[PDB]
Each structure stands twice: as structure tokens, then as C-alpha cells.
Design a protein around this ligand. Structure first.
Ligand SMILES: NC(=O)c1ccc[n+]([C@@H]2O[C@H](COP(=O)([O-])OP(=O)(O)OC[C@H]3O[C@@H](n4cnc5c(N)ncnc54)[C@H](OP(=O)(O)O)[C@@H]3O)[C@@H](O)[C@H]2O)c1
Ligand SMILES: [Mg+2]
Length: 735
């Protein structure tokens, strides 16, 4: 078997030149090959334009080959953070490669010829998030890492004290929202369907011409009522004001790129009711509607020149309304200024952790009314708030843990809905119409309503159920499916979960189905008494739970095990969800200190070894994984993760100590005597040499360093820089 280690960009790229040769040496003792594949920005650019290159310059299409790999049981891929290119990064990479002799074309800035149109289309496929959709052929298994959990117990993060008198609450709609208006069906056979609007006129408008659906696919349609939404919002503005608490609003403007900016605008106009009552027609005509935040409105006013008295009215709105949760007090930035500033899955746990407070204009903590307009998920957070009010803050030294198994494959549910979401222009109805003419789903709609459809396919659902059973069996933790009886979609999924659970041996396992509110309550009841509960959920709750529980248990959601069990039986082990840390590279250029933390790599690696153990029968991989868990725990115990500061332990040093501790554990274990004899002299060499090797890895730091490039660094220079101590290299390369 083979483990593919992704060669990416910037900081993780540099770490990989140090860490991968060690991983390769240790892995080979379990009969496992470790190879890199090049999915760097520069490499993916070269892959896209082979026709311009000499044979020696060519890269082969590594992303496409990894995509194919992922559809086979052979796949075992360790994926590190990589660049999702902005246009500037793309232009910089292109220029760098041209300077190095690769005759690739310029990014056209105004394609007119057919060749230019083709080149632009090819580059546009390379920019942005190009990699994740090719590699994620699966659902999600995310867990707080045990090595990090055990350290938190030793050294807990701060948890704000809660008051029984707290007035913080979530406010959410009671009716006429996506949850209550949702209708859902399961297709009997494949069908290409149409989405249509029929106005009170009779005038038909096709909203989406063709939508191919599979046999067994689950289809939902639903509407958020603009009128109910507006009525609701105006009431919450008044409530925050009467109760003397912060008005706050929590959406996902970035991911839900069609619905949530619209909803946001409704929020802004509610807060500034009097302003829109007097200048509404004019502002809306000029596109100053709040869907790009209050800051866009304010900026646009200078073009209007009755804008001065409008500016004055907004300023008056801010003095007269409830106090707003602040994004940046020093710049005067409120919750309403930029739609993407406050993002629900981050903001809600941060507020819960901070005694249920957000920050006011004086930069002091204050209770908040947290507005989450649609009611599908609001109750999870409300249930946690009420529990903290009654029982006080969670105690990270004793609390249990709540992993997540999440239905994600093929852009499941709301995260595939953006091309099926429509701002309604006129009163009437919207129909999903079958090819045969049948009307499958129908909703009444009014102008300014939001209509949305969502799809999840049957194989992803079956895979999701298998993964829930597998996680419960392997971990011993009970599993709870979070499905809301009041949602049509969740009622359909519940019937399928019941059907498919019968394909599995569940004897000895505790698996049940509860509403999201019931499930949250059970989970937190268990967590407080030190016990564990796996949350089995759809796509959005995946996104929410994988922030909420880690932030409470660990102080952060940035340090997680994230696995995507691939459809054909392989695995993808994602080391990290952040970017590739350009400032980290700057520091190495300036003073040869790499502060990049490889913890996520050590953790994903241990799970990669477990995949070989569990799916491919590799007993030695299991031994390697057990030792690696203990080595990681020791590295954290001695705080040997990289310092930020020059002259102190860096990324290369952390790799050394991790390798020393992992070898020690392999030499000390008695589960595989042959592995023990292999690593006894390795451990002895690293121990005797540790004082000298550690001093040397400190000594290389301090001065300017030449990588030979940035997007396309020189391989000889990177090797010498990232593997600078011959004494260590000799031990690794001999094993
Ligand atoms: O995603 P994105 O690119 O939008 O933004 P992002 O990854 O959230 O922001 C980049 C910054 O986050 C920190 N960071 C991310 N990964 C890290 C790692 N593995 N080890 C240590 N620090 C890390 C670094 O902060 P510091 O600059 O403070 O080291 C880095 O400069
Ligand atoms: Mg999230």
C-alpha cells in the first residue's frame, strides 16, 4: 500500500521537505510506501499548459490523477493546506514561472480571440478552491484530537463564568421560514426536472431549465416569507431595545452566498426602519439596500447629494436604536457594517464561551439578543445557552467529547443550493415540474420571498449511515442522528436511516434518532458528566457542530482530526483547514525560523496508519499509530511545538523531537518484537545525538535565506535549508 503526501505551497511546503523523508522511513517498516504528488499552485498551472513546455518541464496532471485515485479502494491521501489562488497570486505565479523559463501564457485581461478565451477558461479552472472539490469524494468524520484533549485537561483555556441572571437569548422565527415551509420528496426514478414560476398573470418564467436527478435522490423545496421575516426582525429590534441588551445577527454570508446577503439586507433595513420609511424608494433604486452592509450604504451616499441628510438619518438611527454588537470598536464597525464579518458558526460559540456576551461600543462585555432568522438550527445554540444559565460554564478539565459524522458528499443539502435559490419578483407560485409534466413540489410565493431547493443523493446517505455505525463500533461511543420531526427533509432522511441501519450489525451498539434540540440536550448532559456522544448530522450541522463542541472542549476549532472516508473505501486525511501561511515563509526568508505548526500533520498521519490497520489488515501500521499517538502527547507535554521567535525551537526542531519520541515508543513497545529491534538502535542514535542535533537546529537560525523562488522554489535550496543537520539525516536515511 501507498500513502500519498500532498506537496503544496508556502509554509506546509517547507515543512514537508523536513517531515516527509522521516514519515517515509518509518512507514516502510510496515511495508507502506510514502510518495509526494505535486498540487502546488505552480505545479497545477504547469499541468494545465503542457503544450508550451519541453518534455523535461512537464509535471503530469497530479490533481486529476488524485481525483481518479480517490475513486478506488487504494486511496490513502494526506492533504495539507494549499493556496486557493486570488488573481494576484495567480499573476505572481505565472510571472515567476516565465522568469524560470516555462513558456506559459499571460492571464488574458480581456479575451477576444478563441485562443484567449480558452486560456482564460483554463486559468479560471486553476484559481480559487480547485482542489477540495476534486479530493472530497465522501462524507465527514471530525473529532477533537485525543492528544490535544489530554493536554487541555492539564492546561485548560479560559471559560467565562455564567450568571443565572443572564438575559442572552437566541431569537428565531416561529413560522413562515425555510424550516416550516419545507416540502421534501424522494425520487422513484431518474428524472430531468424544471423549476418554474407562474405569476398571478399566468406569465411563466423558467428559473432553472434543467435539473438532473437520480433514482432515490432526496429533493426539498422551501420559502422564506419576506413579510414574516420583516415582521419578526422589527420585533427583535424593539426587544433588544426594551431589554437593554446588544442587538446581534448571525448568518453565513460567505458560504450561503445567495440567500444570506438578502437576509442581511432585511436585517439592516429593520434596524434602520425610519431611514427606509423616508428614503427607501430612492436608496433601493440606487442599490443601497443593505445587502452589502451598512458600510456600502454609507460609502454610496456621497454620490446622491441629498445624501447628507440621509447620512444624518443613519447616524440618528444608531443613537436611537438598541446598542449593536461591535466587530471593531476602534474603527466604529458594528455587526451591520459588513455581512461577512459575523459568521454564525464562529460567533455563536465565541459568545457562549465568553459568558454569553458580545462587545459593546465601550469595548465592554454585554448580554445579547442573538438573531438567527431561520429556525432550522437556532435551537441548538438556545439549548446550550439555557444549559449554561442553569448549570454554569463547561469545565474543560472534566468534560466529555462530541465528535461529528456529517453528510457532505456531492455538495449535500444547503451547500449545493446556490444555483437553486431565487429572489422572487412577483406574487404567484413556484413549481418543480417533472419531465412528464407532473408537479412534484409547489409553493405559493410573494415578491421578495426567497425560494430554495436542495438535493442529497442516496449513496451518500447510505455511506453516512455506514460511517455512523463504524464510528460507534470502533470508538464505543453511542451515536445520535440529529433529525428534526418538524422538517420534511429530516423526516425523509429518518425513514432512510431506519431502512439502512438494518444492513449493519448493530448488536451491542447504542444508536438513536432525536431532534437537534433533544440531541443537543442529551449530548451536553453526557458531556458535563465526562461522557461522549457522536453527533450524526447533515451538512450545515456538520459545519456548526465542528466549531461549537471543539471551541468549548479545546478553546479552538483549528486543531482537529478531519477525515473524509472515500466512497470506494479509501481515505483522505486533512491536516488543517487554514491557509498556507505566507508570513511564515517571509520569516524563513528573513531569519530562517519556520513557525509553522505541524501538529495537524502528526495527527492525520496516525489516522492514515489506522486506515491501513482497519481496512487493509496491516497490524504493524497499528503499532506505528499507537507509538505515534504517545510521541505526539509527549511533544505537547514538553511544549516542543514551534516558537514564533527566532533562536527558539522551530518547525524543524519539532520534527526532530517528534521523531525521537516516536522511535523511543517503538523501541519500548512489546506488541511487535521485530519492530522493537528495528527501532532500538534508531532510538539510541537519536538519544545520544539529541543535545548536538537540537543545538544545531537552533544554530542554523538568524540570517537571510535564499529559497530560489516563492511559488516555484528551487528544490536543491529547499532540501539544504529544511534538512540541514547531517547527523540527523544520516539516522533517518539509514533506517
Ligand atoms: O485560511 P486563510 O489563508 O484565509 O487564513 P489563516 O490560515 O486563518 O491565517 C494565516 C495565519 O494563521 C496562523 N496559522 C495558520 N496555520 C498555522 C499553522 N499551521 N501553524 C501556526 N500558525 C498558523 C498564522 O498566524 P501567525 O502569523 O501569528 O503565526 C498565519 O500567519
Ligand atoms: Mg464551521
Amino acid at each position: 500500500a501507498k500513502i500519498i503526501w500532498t506537496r503544496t505551497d508556502e509554509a506546509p511546503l517547507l515543512a514537508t521537505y523536513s517531515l516527509k523523508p522521516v514519515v517515509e522511513a518509518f512507514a516502510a517498516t510496515a511495508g507502506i510506501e510514502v510518495e509526494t504528488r505535486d498540487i502546488s499552485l505552480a505545479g497545477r498551472i504547469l499541468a494545465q499548459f503542457p503544450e508550451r513546455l519541453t518534455e523535461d518541464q512537464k509535471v503530469g496532471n497530479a490533481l486529476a490523477e488524485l481525483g481518479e485515485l480517490a475513486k478506488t479502494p487504494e486511496a490513502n491521501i494526506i492533504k495539507l493546506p494549499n493556496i486557493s489562488a486570488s488573481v494576484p497570486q495567480l499573476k505572481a505565479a505565472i510571472k515567476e514561472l516565465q522568469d524560470q523559463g516555462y513558456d506559459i501564457p499571460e492571464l488574458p485581461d480581456n479575451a477576444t480571440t478563441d485562443e484567449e478565451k480558452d486560456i482564460l477558461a483554463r486559468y479560471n479552472a486553476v484559481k480559487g478552491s480547485a482542489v477540495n472539490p476534486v479530493l472530497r469524494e465522501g462524507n465527514s468524520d471530525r473529532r477533537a484530537p485525543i492528544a490535544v484533549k489530554n493536554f487541555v485537561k492539564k492546561f485548560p483555556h479560559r471559560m467565562g463564568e455564567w450568571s443565572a441572571d443572564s438575559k442572552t437569548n437566541v431569537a428565531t422565527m416561529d413560522a413562515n421560514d425555510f424550516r416550516h415551509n419545507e416540502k421534501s420528496i424522494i425520487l422513484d426514478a431518474a428524472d430531468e426536472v424544471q423549476i418554474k414560476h407562474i405569476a398571478a398573470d399566468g406569465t411563466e418564467t423558467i428559473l432553472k431549465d434543467s435539473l438532473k436527478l437520480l433514482e432515490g435522490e432526496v429533493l426539498d423545496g422551501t420559502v422564506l416569507s419576506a413579510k414574516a421575516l420583516d415582521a419578526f426582525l422589527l420585533e427583535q429590534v424593539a426587544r433588544a431595545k426594551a431589554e437593554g441588551i446588544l442587538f446581534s445577527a448571525h448568518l453565513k454570508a460567505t458560504m450561503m452566498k445567495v440567500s444570506d446577503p438578502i437576509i442581511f439586507g432585511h436585517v439592516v433595513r429593520a434596524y434602520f426602519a425610519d431611514v427606509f420609511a423616508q428614503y427607501g424608494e430612492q436608496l433601493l433604486a440606487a442599490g443601497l439596500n443593505g445587502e452589502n452592509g451598512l458600510a456600502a450604504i454609507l460609502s454610496g451616499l456621497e454620490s446622491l447629494d441629498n445624501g447628507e441628510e440621509i447620512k444624518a438619518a443613519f447616524e440618528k438611527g444608531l443613537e436611537d436604536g438598541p446598542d449593536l454588537a461591535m466587530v471593531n470598536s476602534a474603527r466604529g464597525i458594528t455587526n451591520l457594517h459588513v455581512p461577512s464579518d459575523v459568521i454564525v458558526d464562529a460567533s455563536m460559540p465565541a459568545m457562549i464561551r465568553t459568558s454569553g456576551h458580545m462587545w459593546n461600543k465601550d469595548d465592554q462585555e454585554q448580554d445579547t439578543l442573538a438573531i438567527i432568522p431561520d429556525s432550522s438550527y437556532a435551537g441548538v445554540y438556545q439549548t446550550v445557552i439555557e444549559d449554561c444559565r442553569k448549570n454554569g460554564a463547561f469545565d474543560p478539565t472534566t468534560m466529555g467529547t462530541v465528535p461529528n459524522v456529517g453528510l457532505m458528499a456531492q455538495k449535500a443539502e444547503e451547500y449545493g443550493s446556490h444555483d437553486k435559490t431565487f429572489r422572487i419578483e412577483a406574487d404567484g407560485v413556484v413549481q418543480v415540474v417533472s419531465s412528464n409534466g407532473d408537479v412534484l413540489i409547489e409553493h405559493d410565493v410573494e415578491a421578495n420571498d426567497i425560494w430554495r431547493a436542495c438535493q442529497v443523493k442516496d449513496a451518500p446517505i447510505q455511506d453516512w449511515v455506514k460511517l455512523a455505525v463504524t464510528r460507534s463500533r470502533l470508538s464505543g461511543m453511542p451515536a445520535v442522528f440529529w433529525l428534526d420531526p418538524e422538517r420534511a427533509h429530516d423526516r425523509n432522511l429518518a425513514s432512510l436511516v431506519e431502512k439502512y441501519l438494518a444492513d449493519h450489525d448493530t448488536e451491542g451498539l447504542d444508536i438513536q434518532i432525536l431532534s437537534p434540540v433533544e440531541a443537543t440536550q442529551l449530548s451536553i448532559d453526557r458531556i458535563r458528566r465526562g461522557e461522549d456522544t457522536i453527533s450524526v448530522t447533515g451538512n450545515v450541522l456538520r459545519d456548526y457542530n465542528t466549531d461549537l463542541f471543539p471551541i468549548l472542549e479545546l478553546g479552538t476549532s483549528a486543531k482537529m482530526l478531519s477525515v473524509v472516508p472515500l466512497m470506494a473505501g479509501g481515505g483522505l486525511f486533512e491536516t488543517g483547514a487554514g491557509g498556507s501561511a505566507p508570513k511564515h515563509v517571509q520569516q524563513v526568508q528573513e531569519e530562517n525560523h519556520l513557525r509553522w505548526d505541524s501538529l495537524g500533520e502528526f495527527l492525520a498521519l496516525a489516522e492514515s496508519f489506522r486506515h491501513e490497520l482497519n481496512n487493509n489488515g496491516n497490524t504493524k501500521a497499528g503499532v506505528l499509530a499507537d507509538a505515534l499517538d504517545k510521541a505526539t502527547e509527549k511533544l505537547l507535554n514538553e511544549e516542543k511545538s514551534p516558537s514564533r521567535k527566532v533562536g527558539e525551537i522551530d518547525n524543524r526542531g519539532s520534527h526532530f523531537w517528534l521523531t525521537k519520541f516516536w522511535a523511543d515508543e517503538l523501541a519500548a513497545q512489546t506488541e511487535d518484537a521485530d519492530l522493537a529491534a528495528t527501532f532500538a538502535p534508531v532510538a539510541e542514535a537519536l538519544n545520544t545525538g539529541a543535545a548536538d542535533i537540537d543545538a544545531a537546529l537552533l544554530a542554523v537560525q538568524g540570517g537571510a535565506t535564499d529559497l530560489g523562488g516563492y511559488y516555484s522554489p528551487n528544490e536543491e535550496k529547499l532540501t539544504n535549508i529544511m534538512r540541514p543537520v547531517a547527523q540527523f539525516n544520516e539516522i533517518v536515511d539509514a533506517l
